[PDB]
Amino acid sequence: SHHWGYGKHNGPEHWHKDFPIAKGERQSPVDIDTHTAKYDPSLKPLSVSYDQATSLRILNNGHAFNVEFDDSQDKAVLKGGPLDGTYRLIQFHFHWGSLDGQGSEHTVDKKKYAAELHLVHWNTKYGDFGKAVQQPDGLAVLGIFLKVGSAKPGLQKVVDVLDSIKTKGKSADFTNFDPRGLLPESLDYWTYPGSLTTPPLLECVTWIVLKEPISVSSEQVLKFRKLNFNGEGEPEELMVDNWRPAQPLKNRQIKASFK
Numbered sequence: 517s518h519h520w521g522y523g524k525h526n527g528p529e530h531w532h533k534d535f536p537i538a539k540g541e542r543q544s545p546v547d548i549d550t551h552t553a554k555y556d557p558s559l560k561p562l563s564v565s566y567d568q569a570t571s572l573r574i575l576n577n578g579h580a581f582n583v584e585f586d587d588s589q590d591k592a593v594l595k596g597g598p599l600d601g602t603y604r605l606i607q608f609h610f611h612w613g614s615l616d617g618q619g620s621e622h623t624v625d626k627k628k629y630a631a632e633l634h635l636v637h638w639n640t641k642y643g644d645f646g647k648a649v650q651q652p653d654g655l656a657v658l659g660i661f662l663k664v665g666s667a668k669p670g671l672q673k674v675v676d677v678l679d680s681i682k683t684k685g686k687s688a689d690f691t692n693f694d695p696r697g698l699l700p701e702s703l704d705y706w707t708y709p710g711s712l713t714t715p716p717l718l719e720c721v722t723w724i725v726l727k728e729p730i731s732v733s734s735e736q737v738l739k740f741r742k743l744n745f746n747g748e749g750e751p752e753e754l755m756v757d758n759w760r761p762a763q764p765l766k767n768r769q770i771k772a773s774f775k
């Protein structure tokens with residue numbers, strides 16, 4: 517209900533008490549064991565078509581910040597790869613850490629990255645996002661790791677607006693943002709069936725996790741860490757470590773798009 521989060525007392529280890537699916541058979545994130553993932557020749561080429569993406573607004577929802585898109589038409593879509601049909605971009609957000617050595621949700625051979633970007637798309641055959649999350653193939657989330665190094669120019673516009681949405685419930689106009697600037701060079705990926713990584717933890721996501729991390733600067737991620745979980749006029753709780761740890765793989769195979 518009201519109060520799941522990422523603190524010591526309402527964090528991932530507590531979510532199962534309100535969302536029993538937390539201990540389910542296809543939970544996310546997972547560790548990606550690179551030596552055990554198998555190249556899959558049946559995967560079709562991945563198609564990220566964001567040229568007509570229409571960003572609208574950026575929102576601090578008390579868990580992360582969301583950059584929201586107009587998904588009232590097929591303006592920005594994800595197709596191909598493991599996906600059947602057309603998945604429409606609705607929003608992106610990140611998960612990040614208090615320190616550069618943690619923050620990602622997925623891990624790679626148990627390595628944690630400083631952060632992880634989630635580009636969230638819903639299967640248009642289900643008509644709207646709320647319907648799609650009730651379906652095993654309702655969403656496709658494109659996950660991209662962030663490591664700390666050189667600045668990501670295409671991220672800076674996001675960074676510079678965070679001061680205006682410091683606290684929970686704050687939003688700002690965020691039009692004309694092009695998410696293609698957040699992508700790495702290669703679209704090589706791993707894929708597996710999983711879930712939302714926050715409550716309600718619905719098992720409705722085809723995860724597509726890019727192999728190549730993007731580099732962002734220390735300065736850029738430091739500004740992520742100045743956001744607040746709390747609302748305005750409440751004691752400051754820095755928005756850090758808003759990641760769920762790796763969950764049991766159970767009866768799933770992670771597939772690779774690349775040899």
Ligand SMILES: COc1cc2c(cc1OC)CN(S(N)(=O)=O)CC2
Nearest residue numbers: 517519520525526530531532533534
């Ligand atoms: C009112 O105090 C609390 C409320 C709740 C939790 C813990 C609390 O004490 C810290 C954890 N749940 S959960 N299972 O993570 O969704 C949500 C509600």
Ligand SMILES: COc1cc2c(cc1OC)CN(S(N)(=O)=O)CC2
Nearest residue numbers: 634636657711712713714715716721
């Ligand atoms: C708006 O409803 C939600 C949307 C999303 C999430 C949770 C939601 O309800 C809490 C978390 N995921 S994620 N982390 O990529 O698995 C995707 C977007």
Ligand SMILES: [Zn+2]
Nearest residue numbers: 610611634713
């Ligand atoms: Zn996420």
